[PDB]
DNA sequence: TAATAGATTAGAGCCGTTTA
């Protein structure tokens, strides 16, 4: 179970991109159930699995396939090992380059099941966003937005709000899957097209990530699409503009050539590596860039 | 009775500031970026292995065609579309021959051994894991 | 200026490709220019034999391998051959005009 | 008349072929070589006659 | 410490490739 997330986190203090890719994988009829069709099935997406590995091999040589200002996309995951808090960030550069580094460094909660980040730990994760947003584009973010898969306490969030610097906006965000609002649509057998919002209330809402595309006419998703639940429970912000900003994370997924993934990027990304970094032993100033662990 | 709204799907950029919604058809049409000038494969595996991957990267070179083309877009070429060289036959190859940590070992010492003692460069490494 | 035929196994015999290739055939007599038909080989299975009769006399354009080798072939031809500021702004605006119309968000309520 | 023909095999032996033919426009010669000067989209034999007992 | 709930949350696996 664990060989590849543990090799990524073996070759990470010698900084070399690697992609791991399965012989059933690129070969996929040779390797048949032994009564029929190939274990795995991959005529139907052939092409477009050639796609995906192309695209990821391009992202792992240095390549930037595609891209998307003064906002911090500040995505970050925790993990269970104690528990680790790790980050994956994006920026927009003066010279219109989208960085997509990563926020890596993962702070330790000795408690067993609070997915909240400690006041120094807290500190320490948002200091090292602010350093980096400072690096990269010369100055300090005018907004930084912080998303994850939980709620966020209070202590922490006056930790956030104490290490911040003045003219530095923070907005929380939380986004949750499979939360029981499966909306089907009336008129046709198609369900309904992505790009779709429920307003809750003015800081709740639902999203359709994933759903039926125009484009593609065809769903992202099979069966009914499952909306992500965006709460900003904390901070202030307009639900319109967070909306957007989500439905732009959704489309960084460098690991694939889709069209969109259901979730945030951002998120997806931070956990990728959270699981990484916590499949072996610590170490220290980890690479940060996602062509190491994607 | 609650109302859906609807918001504009944002726009990826390609190359030649063109932008484009689906990634496939915008790589496909303009491009990435940034332009490398190739791709030094390393592979880490065994022959069959080997067979497997130069064939699959032969392969990458030709178009495949996808079951429903208007669903999911159809792969030109990998020189169709990103524009960098990624041939089979200029591969960097090393041969392979608690279980877990052994097996990981295995693949980290063999790639050590290529990235710090050969000469030959790579610009990224295809473990191709046996199944 | 130039008539590009795509040779695979089925665009080399259809009724209106070589009604097509046949008008190009005749107008490439008129203006006396034999750089005028390119073949664009694109079809594995089809070898360089069992091709159209008419075409069988041309110089093809190997695309059947790497289909940006082909492209690039295409180029060098062309500027070679003086075929007449490229923007790729255009063609962004014309992938969506024609390959999606019926694929798009209309404004209608449901 | 005044060119210089290189004939050879074509998918097996380029190499030698493509590298005489710059070595030899390098150094002033004129060279008519099936896999640099023969344009796509022309009858490649008759232009082939045309260049032996043309231009050669 | 055990239990009964809701609410969050996290991990793992598993099949299909998105109706033309
Ligand atoms: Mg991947």
């Known amino acids: ?294 | 009775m609650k109302e859906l709204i609807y918001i504009e799907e944002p726009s990826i950029l390609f190359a030649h500031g063109q932008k484009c919604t689906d990634p496939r058809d915008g790589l496909a049409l303009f491009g990435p970026l940034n332009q490398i000038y190739g791709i030094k494969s390393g592979v880490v595996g065994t022959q069959k292995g080997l067979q497997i991957f130069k064939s699959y990267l032969d392969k990458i070179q030709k178009p495949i065609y996808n079951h429903n083309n208007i669903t999911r877009p159809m792969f030109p070429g990998f020189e169709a579309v990103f524009g960098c060289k990624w041939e089979s036959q200029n591969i960097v190859f090393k041969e392979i021959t608690k279980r877990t940590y052994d097996l990981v070992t295995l693949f980290n010492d063999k790639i050590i051994t290529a990235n710090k003692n050969d000469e030959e460069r790579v610009d990224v490494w295809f473990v191709i894991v046996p199944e | 200026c130039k008539f590009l035929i795509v040779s695979s196994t089925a665009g080399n015999k259809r009724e209106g490709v070589l009604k097509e290739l046949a008008v190009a055939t005749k107008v490439k007599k008129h203006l006396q220019d034999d750089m005028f038909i390119i073949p664009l080989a694109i079809d594995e299975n089809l070898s360089y034999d069992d091709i159209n009769i008419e075409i069988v006399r041309l110089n093809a354009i190997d695309f059947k391998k790497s289909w940006a080798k082909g492209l690039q072939d295409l180029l060098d031809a062309f500027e070679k051959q003086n075929v007449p500021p490229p923007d790729h702004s255009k063609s962004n605006l014309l992938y969506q005009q024609i390959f999606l119309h019926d694929k798009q968000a209309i404004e209608k309520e449901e | 008349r005044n060119k210089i023909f290189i004939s050879h095999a074509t998918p097996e032996d380029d190499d030698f072929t493509r590298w005489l033919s710059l070595k030899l426009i390098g150094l002033g010669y004129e060279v008519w070589c099936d896999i640099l000067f023969l344009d796509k989209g022309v009858d490649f034999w008759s232009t082939i006659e045309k260049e032996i007992r043309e231009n050669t």
């Open chain 1, 1 to 294: 179970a664990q060989f590849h997330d543990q090799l990524k986190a073996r070759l990470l203090e010698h900084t070399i991109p690697t992609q791991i890719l399965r012989e059933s994988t690129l070969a996929w009829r040779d390797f048949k159930n032994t009564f029929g069709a190939p274990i795995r099935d991959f005529s139907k997406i052939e092409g477009h699995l050639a796609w995906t590995i192309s695209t990821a091999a391009y992202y792992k040589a240095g390549g930037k396939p595609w891209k998307l200002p003064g906002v911090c996309y500040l995505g970050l995951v925790y993990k269970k090992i104690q528990n680790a808090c790790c980050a994956a960030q994006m920026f927009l550069d003066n010279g219109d380059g989208t960085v997509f580094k990563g926020e890596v460094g993962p702070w330790y909660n000795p408690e067993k099941g609070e997915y909240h980040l400690k006041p120094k730990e807290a500190k320490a994760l948002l200091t090292q966003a602010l350093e980096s947003y400072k690096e990269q584009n010369k100055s300090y973010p005018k907004e930084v937005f912080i998303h994850a898969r939980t709620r966020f306490n209070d202590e922490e969030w006056n930790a956030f709000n104490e290490v911040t610097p003045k003219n530095t906006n923070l907005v929380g965000v939380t986004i949750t899957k499979s939360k029981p609002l499966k909306l089907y649509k009336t008129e046709g057998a198609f369900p309904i097209m992505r790009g779709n919002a429920y307003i809750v209330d003015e800081k709740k809402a639902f999203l359709w990530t994933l759903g039926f595309v125009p484009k593609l006419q065809s769903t992202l998703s099979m069966e009914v699409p499952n909306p992500i639940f965006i709460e900003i429970n904390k901070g202030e912000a307009e639900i319109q503009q967070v909306l957007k900003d989500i439905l732009a994370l959704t489309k960084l997924n460098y690991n694939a050539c889709i069209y969109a993934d259901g979730e945030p990027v951002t998120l997806r990304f931070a956990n990728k590596i959270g699981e990484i970094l916590t499949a072996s032993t610590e170490i220290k100033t980890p690479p940060l860039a996602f062509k190491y662990y994607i």
